[PDB]
Write a structure and sequence with these properties.
Chitinase A, domain 3, 2 domains, chitin binding, TIM Barrel, signal, alpha/beta, 16 strands, glycoprotein, Chitinase A, Chitinase_II/V-like_cat, 9 helices, about 350 residues
Length: about 350
């Protein structure tokens, strides 16, 4: 039963690792180490070496059984560009593989994660396959030479097995992934947001083609062992500005991004509700939304998280993950999730 949380280094001043309730997790990720083109000597951003080193001893103090991984990359164009450059260059791949393994050992992490959004089109998937195959082999070799248990290896994946479901250019090779990786973190969110002129459920479990269940179904149908899938749950919501204050449900017309630039942490959503916003549970999508005046936000709440976690158990999945733990400062949703699986 994998109970996974991502801690982003950007949040250190407001949410240091000491604030994570590690009792509610089995694995905690440090996000992110950088690719460091053109040498591809993978590293944490210079200046954050102390934070990276202290992360694992700190989180283990509250739950010694908890393990940690360091995630390399992240969302966004710069990371994607760097992976694409890296994966086409055999010498660069070698430097990346060696330095990433060294990095995990240097800071006392138990594993590595790759966050590459996304290995498409076909050429990019083919070259990513080369990188990951080489990384798997080197991880096994390092275990042999050091005598230590092999580093864990995971990666972030799109919600769906096909890239992309409306126009397939490539797809995740599930047998390859199951053999080389301990699990994948399924990013079952960002289905809807301010890029649309209507409100919607950003992480709908079901409904539409853009749902967590449809995505999970696609990986399983391709042949992914269910235990290799870890269901992502966001600790943030997507927000809109409403066109009309009297149209406040799902599918209401919108005029752009709400605060803050279209995303609001769960903790800020709790503040929003305490400040007069009305919370609504949407049973159709298994999600929540809240609104006040011209601001509308869709997110996961106590009820929808319990339902999603039970869904993951019903579907025989490896577990669940939260992005990102700094966004639920009181750990309300990680608590519900942990209690639900137990
Ligand atoms: C596994 C996963 O969920 N991956 C993707 C997420 O990483 C991504 O969340 C966003 O991550 C970036 C990088 O950590 C965040 O950007 C940072 O934001 C802070 C605060 O605003 C700012 O100080 C930093 O400068 C900025 N760093 C960078 C490198 O841009 C961003 O806040 C995260 N967004 C949310 C909503 O949590 C999500 C969403 O884009 O996508 C996942 O696929
Ligand atoms: C061809 C087309 O219109 N495709 C739409 C997708 O762009 C859209 O995907 C979403 O795009 C957002 C803006 O780039 C991203 O923030 C978000 O991650 C992404 N979500 C997914 C699941 O791919 C989808 C979903 O709204 O709709 C398609 O119609």
């Amino acid at each position: 039963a994998l109970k996974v949380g991502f801690w982003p280094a950007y949040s250190v001043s407001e949410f240091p690792p000491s604030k994570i309730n590690s009792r509610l997790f089995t694995h905690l990720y440090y996000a992110f180490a950088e690719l460091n083109a053109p040498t591809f000597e993978v590293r944490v951003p210079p200046g954050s070496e102390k934070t990276a080193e202290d992360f694992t001893p700190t989180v283990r103090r509250l739950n010694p059984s908890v393990k940690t991984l360091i995630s390399i990359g992240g969302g966004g164009s710069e990371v994607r560009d760097n992976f694409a450059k890296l994966n086409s260059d055999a010498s660069a791949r070698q430097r990346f593989v060696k330095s990433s393994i060294a990095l995990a050992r240097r800071y006392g992490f138990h594993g590595l994660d790759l966050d590459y959004e996304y290995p498409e089109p076909q050429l990019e998937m083919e070259n990513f396959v080369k990188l990951v195959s080489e990384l798997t082999a080197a991880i096994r070799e390092e275990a042999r030479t050091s005598g230590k248990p092999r580093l864990l290896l995971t990666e972030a994946v799109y919600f769906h097995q096909k890239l992309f479901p409306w126009e397939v250019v490539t797809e995740y090779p599930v047998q390859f992934i199951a053999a080389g990786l301990d699990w994948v973190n399924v990013m079952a969110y960002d289905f809807h947001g301010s890029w649309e002129n209507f409100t919607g459920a950003p992480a709908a479990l079901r409904d539409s083609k853009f749902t967590a269940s449809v995505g999970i179904e696609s990986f399983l149908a391709a042949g992914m062992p269910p235990e290799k899938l870890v269901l992502g749950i966001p600790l943030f919501g997507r927000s809109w500005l409403l066109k009309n204050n009297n149209e406040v449900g799902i599918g209401a017309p919108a005029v752009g991004a709400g605060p803050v630039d279209g995303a609001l942490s769960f903790s800020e959503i709790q503040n929003f509700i305490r400040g007069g916003a009305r919370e609504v549970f949407d049973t159709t999508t298994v999600s929540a939304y809240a609104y006040k005046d011209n601001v509308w936000v869709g997110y996961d709440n106590q009820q929808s998280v319990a339902l999603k976690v039970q869904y993951a158990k019903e579907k025989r999945l490896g577990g669940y993950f939260f992005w990102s733990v700094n966004q639920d400062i009181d750990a309300i949703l990680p608590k519900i999730a942990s209690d639900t699986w137990g």
